[PDB]
Amino acid sequence: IVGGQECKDGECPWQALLINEENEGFCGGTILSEFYILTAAHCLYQAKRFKVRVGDRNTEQEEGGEAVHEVEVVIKHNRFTKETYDFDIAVLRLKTPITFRMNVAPACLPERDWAESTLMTQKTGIVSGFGRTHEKGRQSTRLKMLEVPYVDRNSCKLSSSFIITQNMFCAGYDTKQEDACQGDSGGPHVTRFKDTYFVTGIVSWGEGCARKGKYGIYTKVTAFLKWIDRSMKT
Amino acid sequence: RKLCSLDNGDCDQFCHEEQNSVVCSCARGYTLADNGKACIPTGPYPCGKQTL
Ligand SMILES: CC(C)N1CCC(NC(=O)c2cc3ccccc3n2CC(=O)Nc2ccc(Cl)cc2)CC1
Ligand SMILES: [Ca+2]
C-alpha cells in the first residue's frame, strides 16, 4: 500500500495474510466465511506451502487477536494464465473454522447485478494489505488501507500497456502517489454501502506502483460470484 | 431515476426491480426487516461490518 493510512483497530477485519514457511507475508486475502478465503490466482505460485493468518495489523508484536490457519483445499480457477493474469482468482478452504472477533470478520459477497450498477458505480472503493509502501521499498509491518477511486473503463485500457480483459477493472489514481503494491496482491478491494462493506475485487497487478498514467488492476469479483459460490458449496 | 435507480429503492442492501416495483433482499447473515427494506444481522459478527 503506497500512501493511505494504517487500518485502525477494527477497520479492516476481513483482511487475511498468506505466509510462507518462514512466516513472511507474501500475499493478501479476504475472509468470506469461517472456512473460505478469497485471493489472487497468481499468489499460489509465490510459495510452495503457505498458511493463512487473520486478525493481525502489526506483523511484529502480537495483538493477541491473530490466528494462523492451515489451508486444506486450494481452488484455483482453471482458466488462469500467467501470461495475461486473466482469471486471477482462487478460493481457499481452511482446515479449521475462523473464530470471528475484534479484527476478524468476513466481508459480504454481493449479487452480480446490484454490485455492478450500484457498488461499482460508487466513487471509491477501499484496498488494503501488508504490501510495499513504495515500489522499490520493502514489505509493510503495519496493515494498511487506501481509498482508491474507480477508474473509467476506457481510460483504464488506454493507460495499460498490457491487455485489460473483462475479468479485471482499474482503480486508483492517475498521478497521485497512492496505489496498492507488491504483497497486497490477492488482497481485498471492498466498496462501502450504507455502513456495510461488500467485496468487489481482488488485488491483481499493475505496471509498477502509483506510477503516473498507470492504475491498479483488480480482479472483477462480480464476474466470478457464481463461481465463488460453487467452490464454497463443495 | 426510478425504482432501484432512485436511492437504491430505499433498500439497506440488494435492490432489484420486479414488475415496476421495488424488492429488497440481504446478503447471507442478514434477514429482511419488517419494512421489507432494512437488513437485520442474524448473529454476531455479520459480514461487511467493521468491529469498531
Ligand atoms: C502478465 C502481466 C499482466 N503482468 C502481471 C505481473 C505484473 N507485475 C506486477 O504486478 C508487479 C510485480 C512486482 C514486483 C515488485 C514490486 C511491484 C510489482 N508489480 C506491480 C504491482 O504489484 N503493483 C500493483 C499495483 C496495484 C494493484 Cl491493485 C496490484 C499490484 C506485471 C504485468
Ligand atoms: Ca501481531
HEC states along B3-47? HHHCHHHHCCCEEEECCCCEEEECCCCEEECCCCCCEEECCCCCC
Q: Which residue of A has its CA nearest to B16?
A: A114
Which residue is closest in CA terms to ligand 1's atom 28?
Answer: A216
Residue A156: phi, psi to the nearest 5? -40, -65
Report the candidate in A66, A47, A207 with the shortest Cα–Cα distance to residue A143. A66
Residues found in chain A: 234
A162 lines ligand 1 (CB under 6 A): yes
- Count: domains in chain B: 1
A179 within 8 A of A149, measured Cβ to Cβ: no
Question: What number does the ligand 1 atom closest to the CA of A189 have?
Answer: 28
A29 lines ligand 1 (CB under 6 A): no
Domain boundaries, position B40:
1-52
A2: which 3 cell numbers? 503506497
Chain B interface test: which of A63, A103, A104, A118 (most B C-beta within 10 Å)? A118
Residue in A103, A111, A193 closest to B51 by CB: A103
Resolution of the coordinates, Å: 3.0
A76 within 8 A of A41, measured Cβ to Cβ: yes
Domains, in order of start, for chain A: 1-12+107-222 (2.40.10.10), 13-106+223-234 (2.40.10.10)
Residue A153: phi, psi to the nearest 5? -60, -35
Distance A138 CA to ligand 2 centre (A): 18
CATH number assigned to the domain comprising residue B39:
2.10.25.10
